Structures are given as structure tokens and as C-alpha cells.
Amino acid sequence: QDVVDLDFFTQEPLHLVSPSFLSVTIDANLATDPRFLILLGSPKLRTLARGLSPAYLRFGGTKTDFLIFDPKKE
Amino acid sequence: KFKNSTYSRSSVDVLYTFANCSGLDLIFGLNALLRTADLQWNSSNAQLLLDYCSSKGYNISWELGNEPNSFLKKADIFINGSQLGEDFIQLHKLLRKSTFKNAKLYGPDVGQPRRKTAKMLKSFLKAGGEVIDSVTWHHYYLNGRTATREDFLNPDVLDIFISSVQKVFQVVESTRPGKKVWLGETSSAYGGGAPLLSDTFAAGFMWLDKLGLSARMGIEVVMRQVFFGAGNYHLVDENFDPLPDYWLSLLFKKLVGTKVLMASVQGSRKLRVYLHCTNTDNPRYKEGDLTLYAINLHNVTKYLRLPYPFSNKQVDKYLLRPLGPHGLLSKSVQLNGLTLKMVDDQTLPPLMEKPLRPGSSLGLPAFSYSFFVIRNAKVAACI
Ligand SMILES: CC(=O)N[C@@H]1[C@@H](O)[C@H](O)[C@@H](CO)O[C@H]1O
Ligand SMILES: *[C@@H]1O[C@H](CO)[C@@H](O)[C@H](O)[C@H]1NC(C)=O
Ligand SMILES: *[C@@H]1O[C@H](CO)[C@@H](O)[C@H](O)[C@H]1NC(C)=O
Ligand SMILES: *[C@@H]1O[C@H](CO)[C@@H](O)[C@H](O)[C@H]1NC(C)=O
Ligand SMILES: *[C@@H]1O[C@H](CO)[C@@H](O)[C@H](O)[C@H]1NC(C)=O
Ligand SMILES: O=C(O)[C@H]1CNCC(O)(O)[C@H]1O
Ligand SMILES: OC1[C@H](O)COC[C@H]1O
Ligand SMILES: [Cl-]
Ligand SMILES: [Cl-]
Ligand SMILES: [Cl-]
């Protein structure tokens, strides 16, 4: 047997990823939850988000193309 | 199935506040199915949002549309890739005349490259390639409705991702050489995730393997569907408790660096290994250290030996195993025998290494994954 040898190539980087390589999404459909404000307001959640910093947060999903901005909405 | 919905200046502010105060950079997807009389993008709504966001001083990157490939099926509207390129050109003009004239723009967020999606991506890039800073596509391995536990453990399932990636790069390199390529939205299985699978320890083989392959094959950025939400592929559950994949992600953030190297096993499928330079923001480690990570999908423990000149280096183990009794279907995970759980609502726990005897073999139990940091490795490429 169960003893395996590893070969390592270390002469140069083969690629460079973003410092943000591991990023996260919020589905756009989450904004149709009455409780959106509470959810993203959670300090507990923010703590968990802080841990993955630095990172992109992509707000998008199927619902992306079914959302209309309304600057008067309650 | 899907109908129009409006969203408020409040909602914008919640979303941006969440990103901003969490140290995250926000990408907002705009509605691409607002059309004109000649099937051209009607930009007036976005203009409203663009203006509002400038006034409030929000530093935001943009996307336009999501999976345009499924527009006909989901809205009875067909937009070809040419047109969509033109539409991205039109949005670019609007950004360059705004307060954030340098605002980043990414697209087109097409599904994984089957024959239909390849043509759309190619024509999209021939037309709009000029103005996108990154190419976004999405990937899922399986239908969450039908996906099995075996599927999640299966190396032949993991391997399909490889051809997906090759196909994206074949289109990109034939139309916009050197454009950065991002996974725009990705996870285990589609339709919200596989029930009792996508939120477990078992989900981590697909997540960590995706990361290793993506880095190795030249993907610059990977975006995990979803941080939080209704789908069981979420990193964090409805009680704001973190699932195994959150802890896997956090480990990866802290240990794994931006410079991607390569590792492989003499006699090459069920033992999968990745090698980067160690994250230099990690205070424990120093310039030139390596971070190995490894997945073991065999049913027995395996023992990995490091090559010269790394055989007698100090190694720090970071090994992940489910907290029983539900095994790989557990929603709880241990790091080197210690259960990982928030200290309080404001405080992530330390992630304690387990130092190994210098010169010792690297133990990797059946169905597990581990990081290993090779200290004082003095790899010139890492400095
Ligand atoms: C001891 C034994 O026979 N058990 C199974 C075996 O049937 C299988 O072929 C092998 C390789 O997958 O894995 C073992 O768990
Ligand atoms: C959403 O609104 C737009 C208005 O431009 C309309 O064209 C579209 O068909 C609507 N979608 C529906 C009715 O689901
Ligand atoms: C775009 O949509 C707006 C808002 O619904 C509408 O008033 C306007 O006439 C449309 N403009 C074009 C160019 O079709
Ligand atoms: C917005 O954020 C990026 C980093 O994510 C920064 O480099 C950029 O300069 C900011 N926008 C501007 C130009 O004000
Ligand atoms: C794409 O659609 C537009 C109209 O929306 C049409 O004018 C054009 O011919 C189509 N592109 C190609 C190359 O077929
Ligand atoms: O879980 C899925 O099937 C996803 C497909 N892509 C868009 C989305 O992230 O909204 C999800 O619907
Ligand atoms: O346990 C054996 C070893 O892990 C090699 O794969 C097949 C198994 O039978
Ligand atoms: Cl896809
Ligand atoms: Cl097309
Ligand atoms: Cl959601």
C-alpha cells in the first residue's frame, strides 16, 4: 503493498491562480425570499464569509434573467 | 416555470453590505432577457441600477445573463452568441461612461460545453471577446435528482471534468488566445444538489478534486455554488451552520498558494494528488514551503513517500474525516481527530496541524482527503 511513491515537479509554476481562486456564489433567486435582509444581515454568516476572504461573491443564477430593478420598491 | 420579479434598493444594499463587510468582491448578474423590438438588449433597467450603485459608491463587477443556452427552453426566447456579444459591447459602453469607468466585466456564464454550448460560446467570443475581462462557464458532474453515493466516490465520474475543461480551452484558444477562463458557477450536482449527498463529507471528493484539476489545467478562479441558500450544495446550512465543504474550503484558503506545481504517483485514478506552493500569508509557514493535498478513494489506507530532496523534511498533516456515526454521509467533520465547530458566532477555531515524524510515510485512510505542508522545502520557484 500500500506504499506509493510521489514525483514532484518543482522547477517553475505551471500556472498562477488568483488569490481569489476559491470563490463563492449567492443564487439570484435568494433575493425573492421575504427574509433576504435578515439572512445576509446575520453576523454569524458574515463571520463565515470573512474566513474565505479574499474571494469573489457572484450574485447570479437562473433568476438573473427574471429580476427587474425597481428604484421605488418598498 | 420562472416569472419576472422586482428587487429593491434595500436588497442591493443588503447584498453589497454583506460582500463589503465580509471582505468579498461582488459580481452582480444583470437581466439579459429585457429585449427590444428587434431582439436587441434593452439596457434601460441596468442603467437605473448602474446609476444607483455609482451614487452610493459601490465597487462592483458585472455579468450579463446566466446560461443563455437555456433561454429558449426557459423563456421561449432564442438569443444567438453574436447578438449576445453585441449586447456585452453595449453594456461595456455604459460602464466606461460611469463613475467606475474601469469596472470589470465577465461573461457569458454558459453551461458546460456540449455541442450547442460550444457554438454559442465561440460566436459569443468572436463578437464580445474584446470587452470581457474573463470567460465564465459553469460545470456540474451529475443530476442531483438521480446522483448516487457511488457516483460521488467514483474516479471515472471525477475524470469527466477533465474533458469539459479541455473543450472550453479549445474554443477560447481558437478565438481569443490568453483570455482568462473562470468557473463562473459550479458544484457537485444540478437541480439544487443531490439530497443527503451534496451537503456531506462525501461531497468533498468532488469539491477538492475540482479545485486541484482546475488549478492544474489553468482555470484562474472557481466559484462555488452556493455559499448559502436553499440548495443542499450550500457551504452553510439554513441554521447558518457550516457543512464539511465549508471546513474543506477554509483549510484550502489558508494552506494552498497561488503558484501551481505538479505531483503524481508512480503507476497511475483512485489516489489523486495536487501540489502548490504554500500560501505565504500563512504565519506558521515560510517562503519556499510546499502544500500537497491528496484524495484517497481506495477502500484501504495508503502511504505516500516524498521524493528527494523532501524525504526528511518536517511535514504538518491536516487530515479530514467524518464525525460518526453516519460516516461519509455525516454533516460533521474532524481535523486530525478534533471536531471542527465555531467557537462562537464571531470566532472560527484554530486549525491545528499534526506534525509528523521527519522521514515518515504520509498516511491517508480509505475515503479521505488531507493536506500536507512540507516545511523548509526551500523550493526556489516558491520564493
Ligand atoms: C476484501 C474484499 O474483497 N473487499 C472488496 C473487494 O471485493 C474489491 O474488489 C476491492 C477493490 O475495490 O475492495 C474491497 O473492499
Ligand atoms: C418580463 O418582462 C419583459 C419586459 O421587457 C417581458 O418582455 C418578458 O416577456 C417578461 N417575462 C415574462 C412575462 O415571464
Ligand atoms: C425598454 O424598456 C423600458 C422599460 O420597460 C421601456 O419603457 C422602453 O420603451 C424600452 N426601450 C426600448 C429601446 O425599447
Ligand atoms: C475596486 O476593487 C478592486 C479590487 O477588487 C480595486 O483594485 C479597484 O481599483 C477598485 N475600483 C476602483 C478603481 O475604484
Ligand atoms: C443572430 O440574431 C440576429 C438577430 O437577433 C440576426 O440578425 C443574426 O443574423 C443572427 N446571427 C447569426 C450569425 O446567425
Ligand atoms: O442548481 C442548479 O441547477 C443551478 C443551475 N445554474 C443556475 C443556478 O445556480 O441558479 C441553479 O439553478
Ligand atoms: O484494496 C485494493 C487496493 O486498494 C487497490 O485497489 C483495489 C483494491 O482491491
Ligand atoms: Cl453546466
Ligand atoms: Cl449560438
Ligand atoms: Cl437560494
Numbering used by the authors:
A (entry chain B): 1 to 74
B (entry chain A): 159 to 426, 429 to 543
Reported in the publication:
Siastatin B is a potent and effective iminosugar inhibitor of three diverse glycosidase classes, namely, sialidases, β-d-glucuronidases, and N-acetyl-glucosaminidases. Surprisingly, siastatin B also inhibits both β-glucuronidases and human heparanase, which cleave β-glucuronic acid residues but not sialic acid or N-acetylated sugars. Herein, we show through crystallographic analysis of protein-inhibitor complexes that siastatin B generates both a hemiaminal and a 3-geminal diol iminosugar (3-GDI) that are, rather than the parent compound, directly responsible for enzyme inhibition. Notably, 3-GDIs are a new class of iminosugar glycoside hydrolase inhibitor, that have been shown to inhibit both GH2 and GH79 β-glucuronidases.
We synthesized the geminal diol siastatin B breakdown product observed in cocrystal structure with HPSE and its gluco-configured 4-epimer 9, to probe whether this compound would be more potent. Structures of human heparanase soaked with 8 and 9 revealed interactions similar to those seen in the active site of AcGH79. The costructure of 8 soaked into crystals of HPSE showed the inhibitor in the exact same conformation and forming the same protein-inhibitor interactions as the degradation product observed when crystals were soaked with siastatin B. The costructure of 9 and HPSE has hydrogen bonds with the 4eq-OH and Tyr391 and Asp62, as opposed to the hydrogen bond with water seen for 8. The 3ax-OH in both structures is also within H-bonding distance of Asp62, an additional interaction that is not seen in the AcGH79-geminal diol structures. The 3ax-OH in both the 8 and 9 structures is also within 3 Å of the εN of Gln383, however, as for His327 in the active site of AcGH79, this atom is positioned incorrectly to form a hydrogen bond with the axial-hydroxyl. The plane of the amide bond of Gln383 is oriented perpendicular to the axial 3-OH, and the εN of Gln383 already forms two hydrogen bonds with Tyr391 and Asp62. The presence of two additional hydrogen bonds with the active site of HPSE may be able to compensate more fully for the desolvation of an additional hydroxyl in the geminal-diol containing inhibitors. Surprisingly, for HPSE both the galacto-configured inhibitors (8 and 10) were more potent inhibitors than their gluco-configured analogues (9 and 11), reversing the trend seen with all of the other β-glucuronidases.
